[PDB]
Amino acid sequence: MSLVNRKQLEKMANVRFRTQEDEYVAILDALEEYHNMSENTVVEKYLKLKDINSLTDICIDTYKKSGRNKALKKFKEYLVTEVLELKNNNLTPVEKNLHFVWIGGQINDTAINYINQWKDVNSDYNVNVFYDSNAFLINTLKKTVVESAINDTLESFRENLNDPRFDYNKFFRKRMEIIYDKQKNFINYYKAQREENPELIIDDIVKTYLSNEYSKEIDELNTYIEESLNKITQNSGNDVRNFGEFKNGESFNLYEQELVERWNLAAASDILRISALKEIGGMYLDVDMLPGIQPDLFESIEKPSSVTVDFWEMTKLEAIMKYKEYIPEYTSEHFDMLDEEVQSSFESVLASKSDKSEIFSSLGDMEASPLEVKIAFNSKGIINQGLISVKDSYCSNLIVKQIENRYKILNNSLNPAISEDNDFNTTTNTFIDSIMAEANADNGRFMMELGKYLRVGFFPDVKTTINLSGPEAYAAAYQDLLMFKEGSMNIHLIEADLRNFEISKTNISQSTEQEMASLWSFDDARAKAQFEEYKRNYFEG
Numbered sequence: 001m002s003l004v005n006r007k008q009l010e011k012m013a014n015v016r017f018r019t020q021e022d023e024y025v026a027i028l029d030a031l032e033e034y035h036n037m038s039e040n041t042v043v044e045k046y047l048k049l050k051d052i053n054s055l056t057d058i059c060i061d062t063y064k065k066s067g068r069n070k071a072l073k074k075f076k077e078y079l080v081t082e083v084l085e086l087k088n089n090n091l092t093p094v095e096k097n098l099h100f101v102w103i104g105g106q107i108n109d110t111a112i113n114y115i116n117q118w119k120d121v122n123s124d125y126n127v128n129v130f131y132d133s134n135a136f137l138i139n140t141l142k143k144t145v146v147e148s149a150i151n152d153t154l155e156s157f158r159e160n161l162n163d164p165r166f167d168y169n170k171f172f173r174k175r176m177e178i179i180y181d182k183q184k185n186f187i188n189y190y191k192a193q194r195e196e197n198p199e200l201i202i203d204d205i206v207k208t209y210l211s212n213e214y215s216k217e218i219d220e221l222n223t224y225i226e227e228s229l230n231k232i233t234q235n236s237g238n239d240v241r242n243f244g245e246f247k248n249g250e251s252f253n254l255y256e257q258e259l260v261e262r263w264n265l266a267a268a269s270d271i272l273r274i275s276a277l278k279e280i281g282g283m284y285l286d287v288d289m290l291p292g293i294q295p296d297l298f299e300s301i302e303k304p305s306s307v308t309v310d311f312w313e314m315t316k317l318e319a320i321m322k323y324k325e326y327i328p329e330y331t332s333e334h335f336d337m338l339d340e341e342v343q344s345s346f347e348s349v350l351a352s353k354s355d356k357s358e359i360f361s362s363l364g365d366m367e368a369s370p371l372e373v374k375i376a377f378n379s380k381g382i383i384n385q386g387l388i389s390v391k392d393s394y395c396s397n398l399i400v401k402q403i404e405n406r407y408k409i410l411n412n413s414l415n416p417a418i419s420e421d422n423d424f425n426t427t428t429n430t431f432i433d434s435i436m437a438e439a440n441a442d443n444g445r446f447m448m449e450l451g452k453y454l455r456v457g458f459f460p461d462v463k464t465t466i467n468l469s470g471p472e473a474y475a476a477a478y479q480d481l482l483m484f485k486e487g488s489m490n491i492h493l494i495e496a497d498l499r500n501f502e503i504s505k506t507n508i509s510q511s512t513e514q515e516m517a518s519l520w521s522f523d524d525a526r527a528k529a530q531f532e533e534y535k536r537n538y539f540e541g
């Protein structure tokens, strides 16, 4: 399963009676010396593969009317196969680090209780829980602002709360306008202050703002900052403000854009996590992820037919937490819908086990390609809630580059829109017009997905983050890898290509309670339920 030799290819692209051009002879040359490269690093072999590819597309280019073009194009495919061979066969130890991120406010007990499960079965792994010591008040800032906007929109309706269609669609639309205006009022303040006193940290600007505009007590905010700092210190805290390579890189301004202006802590988390992986190596996990259940644990209990495979994965966890109680206040919602007979079997199995290690598996020694970042999977494809990479992996670099390039395209259209000082609607329309003018056949779908950006976290079903800093940057990077290029914007890879980068399902339990509620986004059914709750509160409060 090695790949084609110098004269093995030379008989493949043999065209009768016609001379061998310089750029063709370069392919063969580079190909032979690749086979003498069993001294070189895994990266050096990829870069030799990239170049053979860069010479082959340059041979075709110059000779559009060449008989070699059929074999020259079949060779380009053999090169892809070889990357996949280079990746799977040449594995190095993954650094024993677990990376979590919680930024924007205090860490809640739930996250720590999830994190501690990883701690309890991975004593040989170092754990970082990343926080930003300048920015404990963003979550407070957003919540105050959203609630102020909730109350203002309801003040607008009220005499029309009954009817007709002052429905949940209309509410979130109006609320968006108010939110935009408040956010832009804060952003303007932030920038006025940073220009005046460049020494002021995020939280200083924020608490002064909350005091001036929402009558919050600075003393209580200060107390909150001090408690949050103490709590994260007690829990493997690691400060973004001491991560120097991150502070000084080209992604820090983007990270702050998301933190300070957009209040999207998931997008800020996306930008930081890949950088942690690039700089330290190891395994990244969202705080709503729990260890993998032992393969042979529930092997005696059979999934009944009246149950989703995903319902079953949820119940497996809930049965562990009902009987072993590892995580307090874990839901039993789905477990309780089972039979007597089926609930009995779970207790009976969760009985013969005494150690947490008989329930949850350990990561132990892991290995990956110096080329790759491994990514978790769910039914909708790849997902960056789990990631594995060795320090300075080739992909970690390609993913960083993808994210920065995606932001460069966004900010190029967004910023001129914003720096005209208009309301939500006009700014949206200018922004979209601009995105539309810069769109082309290469970046089309991605551009369509960018136009909802001003609404992220504030309106139902707005997922822009996925295309900017999330899973799509990862797919683009894998395509960069497999196509010997950089800057893919048009994803043509299918499921089978991406499967090469999967973390095995046994290493993570993804079907957790906290996974089932998104911190940066919300669907329509949730938006409807929220609307109705807010009306009641307004009526009763």
Ligand SMILES: O=c1ccn([C@@H]2O[C@H](COP(=O)(O)OP(=O)(O)O)[C@@H](O)[C@H]2O)c(=O)[nH]1
Pocket: 100, 101, 102, 103, 104, 105, 139, 265, 266, 267, 269, 285, 286, 287, 288, 385, 515, 517, 518, 519, 520
């Ligand atoms: O206030 C917040 C909210 C989210 N996050 C980060 O964003 C990640 C993704 O959150 P979530 O799992 O809700 O996103 P989802 O899986 O629904 O896309 C979390 O794990 C945290 O790392 C954060 O740091 N602070």
Ligand SMILES: OC[C@H]1O[C@H](O)[C@H](O)[C@@H](O)[C@@H]1O
Pocket: 266, 267, 269, 270, 286, 383, 384, 385, 465, 466, 469, 470, 471
């Ligand atoms: O990229 C946006 C989000 O996408 C995914 O759903 C991940 O669960 C989360 O870690 C990330 O923040």
Ligand SMILES: [Mn+2]
Pocket: 286, 288, 385, 514, 515, 516, 518
């Ligand atoms: Mn999640």
